[PDB]
Design a protein around this ligand. Structure first.
Ligand code: SPH
Lengths: 246, 232, 116, 246, 246
């Protein structure tokens, strides 16, 4: 059994390295301990009719630990991630979770106006978001929601979810593995970029096969996403950034 | 194994010049089509876009080729001498022309082509002019951040997946010839051939028709066709 | 500083990279890069703004993605002047480029114009 | 002219090292950039009738920059300090500021109950406190203030202010120097201690000579205390500590 | 204290060399003593509302010493200059004088006719001229003044005075220095040119900060411009040139 320990956080179990590149550094400010903890996101229930979940990195780790504090205080920071998606399932639970790590995971909005989604709805953080079977158009012209309308089979970006495996992916197949680990290096056009506005990665937990258990009516098991910022180094220390999330 | 991957290379995959824009330029009388400024981008056409959206980041020395095709409009028996078209670059910040007879057409520091109609299409190479270390076909962020201390929401309101408003400036095409009574409507087709292409972080291609300059989509969300499960 | 030689004080000159609220207060300005300038000791202070940017090159236009930052000045300690001294003094500011400074993508300036 | 630069903060002018020991380290978490900034405390006016001011370190740097965040998130942290007290005065201003750096600067309370001062009043932070000419006893038995009653000539600790120069001291004599710098190493019985509860040092800015200027009725000049955490290393990362300050 | 002596003239005090080039020679006629004297121009009062002064070199040194005689008798002469602008100010006087040395200091005329200013008004000499807050247009169509209309913030040449520091400049900041010295080499498109018609340099003494003193109503201090022709060599000895100055 694999037991990976980083900083002051240990996770017991296969792990895959995104694009075969390990997170490594490039005077940046690198907390070797305060930012290497495996911050645990909000656990999400995998309902029988669930369509999927999506988080934005490092947006997900904006309020957890000192990583978010260094991210808001500093101007521009680069950080690799280690995403451990653990789904406790019994021998009689069937299902598969595609854990995709989309670089620059641009999602589609609900309104007819292109790229009209707001910053608050595009950066939900630890909460994340969820996919939808169809594309429900925003009809509130007086007060547009300005939120994503991610579609499962379209991956929220118009591409096919079947081809989404071009990204760094890992399949949590409850019959063979109850957890998955993806080590994402800092992927960006720039050597280092502002994290408060830019989301380096996007994690998508999509049920490739529906969850069933003993022919039960409704079955829901927990899914815990634990993200660890690896080699997170920031630069441009200045006054704290307090974004408007409404 | 023994079969070479020459045609499959990224340099070969983008070795074709793709129409990225069609600019209509007229020499009509001052009655707005005298000149035309097209924001330089491949997202006006879907083919080269989709070829580029195959990857998240790109770094290529572009090659633009302008094919100008002119016609006589509103005249059955029309005459006009061989026209010269000025294709001027206006990078982000350079003053844009407000009229055909504007000073900015002098091109003291803006690079410009003067293509004589009927000659070989005007080709020019452009290096990687990206600010970052690679072109960002996809951006999962914004340009501004709405802060708690902002007076209003429009201060930090920015378009999603939009880095800069003036991405790479505008291409201003005009007919250098004086406005003649005979109206000659011309179409300048810009063909983009990425050279020395280096791509990073591949992405699956868009299976639904594009909708705007982002990853949004409105209709035609049915890429796959009906087919039996056990039908070969 | 263009005040009297008998005029002393401390000016906090602060560069705050973008991505946060502009430094409307000295408590926010002292969080970013900053330098205290004693008006009595030295009449001119060199606030070097290091090249910190996400992109390798910022744009010359005003755009929020390649925005440079925010330069501010505050009174670390107010100006103290004795009697028979001008209480209100002026100062000058000179902007310059360092050796690492460079530009590219030559273009036409928006300043000059020609009516035609 | 001396111009000392640390991290991303520069101060232009003599500096004295406390106890001849320079701040040095002893897996602790040491932000080499985020915690080395010269955080500027609230400027205090040196009135003609002023009696003095006192701050507690690292209590003073609890809300400034990421130093306070690392101090609250981590269990126990050690940090040297560099205190620059700058007082802009003209050639015609006369006065002297004793800048004393008391290790374990225990102050006296106002109530008759010994050691009854509360944590909120004993840790004012960037605000600090002020000395008083006499010892005013707390008379509110229904709601005791539970705040210090620091006396100038007693240094708030029963000792004589004249002997307070046994501590690391620096005299800002407006005729010869308008600023003072004291470099305090981490002084504590322990190699590293909780900072949220313990104040390693106490800075006391006491007017040894009254401030006068051109025989004016009331004269007040600014005093700016800029403290820089040097070699600040923390350990015991855990949930943020949110003390009650009322 | 710096004490620079040339020929038979000594000046007691920093000095700056224009464009990093020292005045040096290229059969020219070079008076090693008669033309190296520090000829003192007319002292000008720096009023509180003063806008600036401008002199043309070698036009300024046309009637002082044998330099002017050699300049008028000879056809074409090249001469470096050393301009010492000394402004006696007390410790309580505040202000700054930008001393700019514009090569080919072309000034703008007052009339609508371009380049219509006359030779007499364009070459005032030791008297020099003064800048004006705004651009007053010449309205005397019957008898046009044909004189420059130099504007302070435009430097009399349409450029911004703030950018005027591209020229060899020196700031007389009365708090740190009461004098400035600029050593100008012979700057011209030609190795040697007629001085009676061409002005190799232009000295501009512009108050960058207004002059104030003890909150007085009107304060004016002297400014003395002492120019020394260095390595002045002439050629083409012939009958004296007597220009018309009216
Ligand atoms: C006649 C002179 C014409 C000069 C033409 C040179 C203009 C250079 C602009 C080429 C840049 C286009 C390639 C970049 C594409 C971007 O990555 C996408 N718009 C999205 O980021």
């Amino acid at each position: 059994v694999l037991q990976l320990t980083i900083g002051n956080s240990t996770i017991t179990t296969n792990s895959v390295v995104a694009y075969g590149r390990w997170p490594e550094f490039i005077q940046p400010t690198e907390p070797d301990v305060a930012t290497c903890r495996f911050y645990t996101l909000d656990t999400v229930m995998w309902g029988k009719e669930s369509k999927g979940w999506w988080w934005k990195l490092p947006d997900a780790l904006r309020d957890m630990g000192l990583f978010g504090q260094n991210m808001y205080y500093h101007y521009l920071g680069r950080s690799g991630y280690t995403v451990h998606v653990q789904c406790n399932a019994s021998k009689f639970h069937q299902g598969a979770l595609g854990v995709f790590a989309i670089p620059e995971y641009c999602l589609a909005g609900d309104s007819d106006k292109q790229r009209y989604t707001s910053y608050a709805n595009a950066n939900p953080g630890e909460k994340g978001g969820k996919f939808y079977s169809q594309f429900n158009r925003d009809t509130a012209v007086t007060s547009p929601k300005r939120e994503f309308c991610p579609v499962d089979y379209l991956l929220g970006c118009g591409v096919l979810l079947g081809n989404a495996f071009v990204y760094p992916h890992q399949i949590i197949n409850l019959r063979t593995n109850n957890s998955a680990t993806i080590v994402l290096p800092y992927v960006n056009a720039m050597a280092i970029d502002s994290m408060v506005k830019h989301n380096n990665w996007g994690i998508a937990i999509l049920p490739l096969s529906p969850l069933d258990f003993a022919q039960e009516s409704s079955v829901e098991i927990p899914i815990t996403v634990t993200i660890a910022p690896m080699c997170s180094e920031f630069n441009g220390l200045r006054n704290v950034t307090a974004p408007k999330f409404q | 194994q023994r079969r070479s991957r020459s045609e499959s290379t990224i340099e070969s995959f983008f070795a074709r010049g793709a129409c990225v824009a069609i600019i209509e330029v007229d020499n009509e009388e001052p009655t707005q089509k005298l000149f035309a400024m097209w924001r330089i981008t491949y997202k006006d056409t879907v083919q080269l876009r989709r070829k580029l959206e195959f990857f998240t980041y790109s770094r290529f020395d572009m090659e633009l080729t302008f094919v100008v095709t002119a016609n006589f409009t509103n005249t059955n028996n029309g005459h006009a001498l061989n026209q010269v078209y000025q294709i001027m670059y206006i990078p982000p910040g350079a003053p844009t022309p407000k009229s055909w007879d504007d000073y900015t057409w002098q091109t003291s520091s803006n690079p410009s082509i003067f293509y004589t109609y009927g000659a070989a299409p005007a080709r020019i190479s452009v290096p990687y002019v990206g600010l970052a270390n690679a072109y960002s076909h996809f951006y999962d962020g914004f340009a501004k951040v709405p802060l708690k201390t902002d007076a209003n929401d429009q201060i930090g309101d920015s378009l999603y997946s939009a880095m800069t408003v003036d991405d790479f400036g505008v291409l201003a095409i005009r007919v250098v010839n004086d406005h003649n009574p005979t109206k000659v409507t011309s179409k300048v087709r810009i063909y983009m051939k990425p050279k020395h292409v280096r791509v990073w972080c591949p992405r699956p291609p868009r299976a639904v028709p594009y909708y705007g300059p982002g990853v949004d989509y409105k209709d035609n969300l049915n890429p796959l066709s009906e087919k039996g499960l056990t039908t070969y | 500083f263009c005040g009297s030689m008998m005029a002393t004080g401390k000016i906090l000159v602060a560069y705050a990279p973008p991505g946060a609220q502009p430094p409307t207060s000295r408590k926010e300005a002292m969080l970013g890069t900053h330098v205290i300038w004693d008006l009595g000791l030295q009449s001119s202070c060199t606030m070097v703004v290091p090249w910190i940017s996400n992109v390798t090159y910022r744009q010359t236009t005003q755009d929020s993605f390649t925005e440079g930052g925010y330069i501010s000045m505050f009174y670390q300690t107010r100006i103290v002047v004795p009697l028979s001294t001008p209480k209100s003094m002026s100062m000058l500011g000179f902007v310059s480029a360092c050796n690492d400074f460079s530009v590219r993508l030559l273009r036409d300036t928006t300043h000059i114009s020609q009516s035609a």
